[PDB]
């Protein structure tokens, strides 16, 4: 599924992300835009052989099992494939643990490089939340 900006903002809000660990909703939408272009189905392979899955591009080396990242962990205890669903619940619940992990949203390289320090509130403008 390719989410609309406002549609994603709303679903993320319902699933408890707005101000989760102090990150305004605009941050989560911004990160998803630049990680996956709002596409739940996005996959990208990393150099180290792990793969990032879904709307927030969650990595198989630490967070989910995809059966092909040797010596990886499954800290969210989910098949990576579950992160590709049109239902974003799995991705949101797993993002909650990542953003709690100590390094906040810095964990998402595209958020660090493209959202951090910007006016992320622009990402939820016009939206009826």
Coordinates of C-alpha atoms in Angstrom, one line a residue:
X1 CA 0.0 0.0 0.0
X2 CA 1.1 3.5 -0.8
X3 CA -0.1 5.8 1.9
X4 CA -1.1 9.4 1.4
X5 CA 0.7 11.8 3.7
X6 CA -2.4 12.8 5.8
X7 CA -3.7 9.3 5.7
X8 CA -0.4 8.0 7.1
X9 CA -0.3 10.8 9.7
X10 CA -3.7 9.8 11.0
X11 CA -3.0 6.0 11.2
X12 CA 0.3 6.8 12.9
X13 CA -1.6 9.0 15.4
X14 CA -4.2 6.3 16.1
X15 CA -1.4 3.8 16.8
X16 CA 0.2 6.1 19.4
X17 CA 3.2 7.6 17.6
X18 CA 2.3 11.3 18.1
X19 CA 4.8 12.5 20.7
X20 CA 6.0 8.9 21.3
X21 CA 9.2 9.5 23.3
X22 CA 8.9 13.2 22.5
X23 CA 8.9 12.9 18.7
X24 CA 6.0 15.0 17.2
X25 CA 4.0 13.2 14.6
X26 CA 5.6 15.3 11.9
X27 CA 8.9 13.4 12.5
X28 CA 7.4 10.0 11.9
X29 CA 5.7 11.1 8.7
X30 CA 8.9 12.7 7.5
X31 CA 10.9 9.6 8.3
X32 CA 8.5 7.4 6.4
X33 CA 8.4 9.7 3.4
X34 CA 12.2 9.5 3.0
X35 CA 12.7 5.9 4.1
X36 CA 10.0 4.3 1.9
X37 CA 8.1 7.0 0.0
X38 CA 5.0 6.0 2.1
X39 CA 5.1 2.4 0.5
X40 CA 4.6 -0.4 3.0
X41 CA 6.1 -2.8 0.5
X42 CA 9.5 -1.2 0.2
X43 CA 12.6 -3.4 0.6
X44 CA 16.2 -2.4 0.3
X45 CA 19.2 -4.6 0.7
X46 CA 22.2 -3.4 2.8
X47 CA 25.9 -4.0 2.2
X48 CA 26.1 -6.2 5.3
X49 CA 23.5 -8.5 3.7
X50 CA 20.6 -7.5 6.0
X51 CA 17.5 -5.9 4.5
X52 CA 15.3 -3.0 5.5
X53 CA 11.5 -3.7 5.4
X54 CA 8.5 -1.6 5.0
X55 CA 7.3 1.9 5.6
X56 CA 10.0 2.8 8.2
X57 CA 12.6 0.5 6.7
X58 CA 13.2 -1.6 9.7
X59 CA 16.5 -3.6 9.6
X60 CA 16.7 -7.4 9.7
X61 CA 20.0 -7.5 11.4
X62 CA 18.5 -6.4 14.8
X63 CA 14.7 -6.2 14.6
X64 CA 13.0 -8.8 12.5
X65 CA 13.7 -12.3 11.2
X66 CA 13.8 -12.8 7.4
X67 CA 15.6 -16.1 7.4
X68 CA 18.7 -14.8 5.5
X69 CA 20.6 -12.5 7.8
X70 CA 23.1 -14.8 9.5
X71 CA 23.7 -14.1 13.2
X72 CA 21.0 -11.4 13.3
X73 CA 18.6 -10.7 16.2
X74 CA 14.8 -10.6 16.1
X75 CA 14.2 -8.0 18.9
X76 CA 10.7 -7.2 17.6
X77 CA 10.1 -11.0 17.3
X78 CA 8.3 -10.8 14.0
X79 CA 8.8 -12.1 10.5
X80 CA 10.2 -9.2 8.5
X81 CA 7.4 -9.9 6.0
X82 CA 4.9 -8.7 8.6
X83 CA 6.4 -5.2 8.2
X84 CA 5.3 -5.1 4.6
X85 CA 1.5 -5.3 5.3
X86 CA -1.0 -2.6 4.4
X87 CA -1.7 -2.7 8.2
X88 CA 1.1 -0.6 9.7
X89 CA 0.6 -1.9 13.2
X90 CA 3.5 -4.3 13.1
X91 CA 5.8 -1.5 11.8
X92 CA 4.6 1.0 14.4
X93 CA 4.9 -1.4 17.4
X94 CA 8.4 -2.4 16.3
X95 CA 9.4 1.3 15.7
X96 CA 8.4 2.0 19.3
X97 CA 11.1 -0.4 20.6
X98 CA 13.7 1.0 18.2
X99 CA 13.1 4.6 19.2
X100 CA 13.2 3.5 22.8
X101 CA 16.5 1.8 22.2
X102 CA 18.6 4.7 23.4
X103 CA 19.5 6.6 20.2
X104 CA 16.0 7.9 19.5
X105 CA 15.1 8.5 15.8
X106 CA 18.7 8.8 14.9
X107 CA 18.4 5.1 14.2
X108 CA 16.7 6.0 11.0
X109 CA 19.5 7.4 8.9
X110 CA 17.1 9.3 6.6
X111 CA 15.4 11.0 9.5
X112 CA 18.8 12.1 10.9
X113 CA 19.9 13.4 7.5
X114 CA 16.7 14.8 6.1
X115 CA 14.2 15.4 8.8
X116 CA 16.1 16.2 12.0
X117 CA 16.3 19.9 12.7
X118 CA 13.8 20.8 9.9
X119 CA 10.2 22.1 10.3
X120 CA 8.7 18.6 10.4
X121 CA 5.3 20.1 11.3
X122 CA 4.9 20.8 7.5
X123 CA 4.4 17.1 7.0
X124 CA 1.1 17.1 8.9
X125 CA -0.2 20.5 7.7
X126 CA -3.6 20.5 6.1
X127 CA -4.3 17.1 7.6
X128 CA -7.5 16.5 9.5
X129 CA -6.2 14.5 12.5

